[PDB]
Amino acid sequence: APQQINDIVHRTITPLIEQQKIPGMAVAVIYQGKPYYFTWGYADIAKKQPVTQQTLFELGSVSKTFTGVLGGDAIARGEIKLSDPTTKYWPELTAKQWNGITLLHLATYTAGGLPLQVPDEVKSSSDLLRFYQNWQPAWAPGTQRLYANSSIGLFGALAVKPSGLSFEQAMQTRVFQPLKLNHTWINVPPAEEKNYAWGYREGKAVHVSPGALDAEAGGVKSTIEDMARWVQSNLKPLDINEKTLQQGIQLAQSRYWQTGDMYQGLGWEMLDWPVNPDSIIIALAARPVKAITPPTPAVRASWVHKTGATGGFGSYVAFIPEKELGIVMLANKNYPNPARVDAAWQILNALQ
Numbered sequence: 001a002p003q004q005i006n007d008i009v010h011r012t013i014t015p016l017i018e019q020q021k022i023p024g025m026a027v028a029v030i031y032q033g034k035p036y037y038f039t040w041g042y043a044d045i046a047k048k049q050p051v052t053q054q055t056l057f058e059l060g061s062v063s064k065t066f067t068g069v070l071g072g073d074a075i076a077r078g079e080i081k082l083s084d085p086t087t088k089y090w091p092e093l094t095a096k097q098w099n100g101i102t103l104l105h106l107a108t109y110t111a112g113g114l115p116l117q118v119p120d121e122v123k124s125s126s127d128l129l130r131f132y133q134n135w136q137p138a139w140a141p142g143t144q145r146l147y148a149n150s151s152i153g154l155f156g157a158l159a160v161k162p163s164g165l166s167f168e169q170a171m172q173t174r175v176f177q178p179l180k181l182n183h184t185w186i187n188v189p190p191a192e193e194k195n196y197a198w199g200y201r202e203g204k205a206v207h208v209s210p211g212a213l214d215a216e217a218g219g220v221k222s223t224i225e226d227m228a229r230w231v232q233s234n235l236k237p238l239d240i241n242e243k244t245l246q247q248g249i250q251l252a253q254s255r256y257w258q259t260g261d262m263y264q265g266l267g268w269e270m271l272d273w274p275v276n277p278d279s280i281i282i283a284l285a286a287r288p289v290k291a292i293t294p295p296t297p298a299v300r301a302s303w304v305h306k307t308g309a310t311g312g313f314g315s316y317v318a319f320i321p322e323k324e325l326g327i328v329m330l331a332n333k334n335y336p337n338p339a340r341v342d343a344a345w346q347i348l349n350a351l352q
């Protein structure tokens with residue numbers, strides 16, 4: 001590895017790991033299009049298993065980038081449109097508040113105040129229908145953003161309905177397989193359990209226990225190598241051979257809404273590059289949005305990023321298409337987002 005990369009990465013991450021008491025971490029830097037891998041510490045503290053380039057981490061909400069691109073591929077296939085009403089794909093959603101809520105609104109958290117979490121009481125499909133029918137929006141569609149798993153999670157479930165595939169089958173066949181992400185999973189198979197790191201919350205070993213729509217909103221587990229390849233694919237979507245997947249990547253990096261300095265994509269979030277690091281960086285935050293009419297196609301001069309967490313894991317991905325530069329940070333503790341972004345900016349700034 002080039003010494004410049006070696007030095008900035010170790011000099012940034014070692015102190016981060018110490019300060020945040022992170023049990024294990026894997027980092028990939030993509031520099032001039034090529035990946036460089038770094039690992040520290042433990043996938044499993046009790047069994048003394050190290051983090052390796054084959055270790056699986058829970059991505060948490062970084063999974064929304066995969067859901068956004070799968071939705072994007074479905075649009076490119078002519079299976080769905082973001083301008084379509086939600087009721088087109090769920091005819092049993094007859095409650096009047098749904099008039100005017102489109103797939104776009106669901107995908108971008110702008111439906112009018114769908115909650116962060118689907119209630120734990122919702123187990124059955126009829127429980128799920130009841131939840132969305134009974135939900136009362138605070139706001140008109142397309143006026144305020146409230147980050148929500150019940151919003152993008154429903155988009156993911158509906159986006160695959162025309163295909164007739166399960167969400168997992170669609171993701172596997174249409175996104176993971178074409179991009180050769182052969183160690184990326186929504187459900188970790190028994191063959192791969194040996195490599196599934198434990199998450200750590202207040203010292204306790206924990207794995208995600210998915211409720212309704214958690215697969216769609218936060219369900220991906222992946223290795224540092226596959227995540228580097230995911231960044232490579234999002235950096236250069238035009239090198240991807242599957243035409244609908246190529247367009248799908250581009251659609252997920254389009255700017256649909258603006259709030260302050262941030263632009264909402266499908267899963268992905270973006271800021272103009274160069275960004276101030278203060279601007280890149282709370283349980284519920286309702287923010288008015290301006291519609292970008294029509295959406296701006298993927299801007300090469302962007303900082304494109306997404307944070308992700310589960311009870312036991314914290315992930316971050318960021319890239320700058322213009323510079324062919326990117327980073328993935330995977331950890332088996334959920335530590336504060338600003339620490340993630342600060343470390344990522346330190347590394348990418350140094351290498352830009």
Ligand SMILES: OC[C@H]1O[C@@](CO)(O[C@H]2O[C@H](CO)[C@@H](O)[C@H](O)[C@H]2O)[C@@H](O)[C@@H]1O
Binds near residue numbers: 167213216
């Ligand atoms: O073990 C996870 C468990 O969650 C369930 C029950 O809510 O819900 C899913 O049904 C779909 C297909 O399995 C999921 O993709 C979606 O997240 C959710 O409604 C079970 O199905 C799933 O086994």
